[PDB]
């Protein structure tokens, strides 16, 4: 009658309690309430399905409240201190003239309503009129500086390529895709700002994912194997002329399912806790 | 609940492959003011392109999963009003059977 599905660590049976989290790579718009300079925000928490899992969040803000003018639109980029007027980002991606930029954001040329609210954005970025000067304007805003005209420009590329909208593609020739997407976000933004579409329900179970014992272990082994990967990188540097510590990966897993503190290893706060726990055996249904 | 299960997690590409092979203009070559009603197609929150006859694409997809050709655990939704086609393949989705 035993149904299994548990672990046996040091005798006691452990259960991995499923973890709930907001799904990633998902576009959501929210109203930022009264006291804010921002009125609506389009977030996407974007990450690689696996592979070091970038936890870069792309925020895209609509400044100006529903009462002000200069309702501009900027977006906070990974590794960049300031918020950047979207237009500049578009040009930093190769989409250079106004309205070629607008065309990515608004698929109807009769939605005068949406277009009007873009006019200010356009005026904002108006001051930077070609890709390389938008790359510099982006790279001037570190990080720090990188203080070198040619360096900050080749810096900015690096961010757009790798840290910005990191799903989709982290490779290269996809400014088209990334610019079109950024547009889709801006559309989804102005939509809610126009009382046309509704603000995202943050409680919709659909946009939630549950991590089971599989994904749970994977996150751990990943962390652990990369600890051993760079143990070898040291007994190789030592030998300036097969002792690869097998205990790390055993006693690592052990520690976790033992304590339920899901993090390498004894340096584990914050980590997440009560992820594993001793299995109830009071009653079969229990 | 009792019938609740969770997506193990599958791969997009045999869909992405299949999808463009069944009438998907890639985003690379989109120009909206030209086909401004194209249902835009997503997979795991990645915009891949657009489709001019989504009604009949949907059929092909729905028949694929129901036949077992696409994985029964994959999630495909057509939001007609909004003109979007979202598809999920990723692990973590709680689902029931009906």
């Amino acid at each position: 009658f035993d149904m299994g599905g548990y672990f046996i660590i040091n005798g006691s049976e452990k259960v991995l309690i499923a973890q709930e989290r907001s799904a990633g790579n998902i576009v959501q718009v929210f109203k930022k309430a009264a006291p804010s300079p921002i009125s609506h925000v389009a977030e996407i928490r974007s990450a690689l399905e696996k592979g070091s899992r970038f936890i870069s969040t792309l925020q895209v803000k609509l400044y100006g409240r529903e009462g002000s003018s200069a309702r501009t639109i900027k977006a906070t980029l990974p590794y960049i201190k300031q918020d950047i007027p979207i237009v500049i980002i578009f040009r930093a991606l190769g989409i250079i003239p106004d309205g070629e930029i607008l065309e990515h954001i608004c698929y109807d040329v009769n939605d005068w309503q949406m277009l009007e609210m873009l006019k200010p954005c356009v005026e904002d970025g108006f001051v930077i009129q070609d890709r390389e000067t938008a790359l510099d304007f982006i790279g001037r805003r570190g990080t720090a500086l990188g203080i070198k005209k040619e360096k900050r420009i080749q810096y900015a590329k690096d961010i757009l390529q790798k840290e910005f909208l990191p799903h989709i593609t982290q490779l290269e020739g996809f400014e088209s895709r990334k610019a079109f997407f950024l547009g889709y976000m801006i559309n989804r933004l102005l939509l809610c700002a126009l009382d046309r579409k509704d603000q995202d329900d943050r409680d919709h179970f659909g946009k939630k994912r549950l991590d089971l014992a599989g994904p749970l272990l994977a996150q751990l082994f990943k962390t652990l194997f990369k600890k051993l990967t760079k143990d070898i990188f040291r007994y190789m540097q030592r030998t300036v002329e097969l002792a690869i510590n097998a205990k790390t990966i055993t006693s690592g897993l052990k520690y976790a399912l033992a304590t339920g503190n899901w993090g390498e290893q004894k340096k584990a706060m914050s980590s997440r806790a009560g992820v594993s726990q001793v299995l109830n055996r009071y009653t079969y249904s229990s | 609940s009792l019938m609740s299960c969770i997506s193990v997690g599958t791969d997009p590409m045999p869909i992405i492959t299949f999808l463009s092979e069944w009438g998907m203009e890639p985003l690379e070559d989109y120009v909206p003011h030209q086909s401004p009603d194209a249902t835009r197609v997503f997979v795991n929150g990645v915009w891949h392109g657009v489709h001019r006859n989504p009604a009949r694409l949907m059929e092909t997809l729905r028949t694929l999963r129901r036949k077992g050709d696409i994985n029964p655990e994959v999630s495909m939704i057509r939001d007609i009003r909004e003109k979007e086609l979202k598809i999920f393949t990723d692990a973590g989705r709680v689902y029931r059977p009906l």
């Binding site: 089971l212 014992a213 599989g214 082994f221 194997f225 990369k226 990967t229 | 193990v8 997690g9």
Partner: peptide, 30 residues
Amino acid sequence: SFNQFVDYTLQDIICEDSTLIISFGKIYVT
């Protein structure tokens, strides 16, 4: 969930990063 982790995922993690200056190929589970 676990099954899939063992069968697939575990291989993936072993060689998505991995290789040094030493490479890691297939993984065997007893």
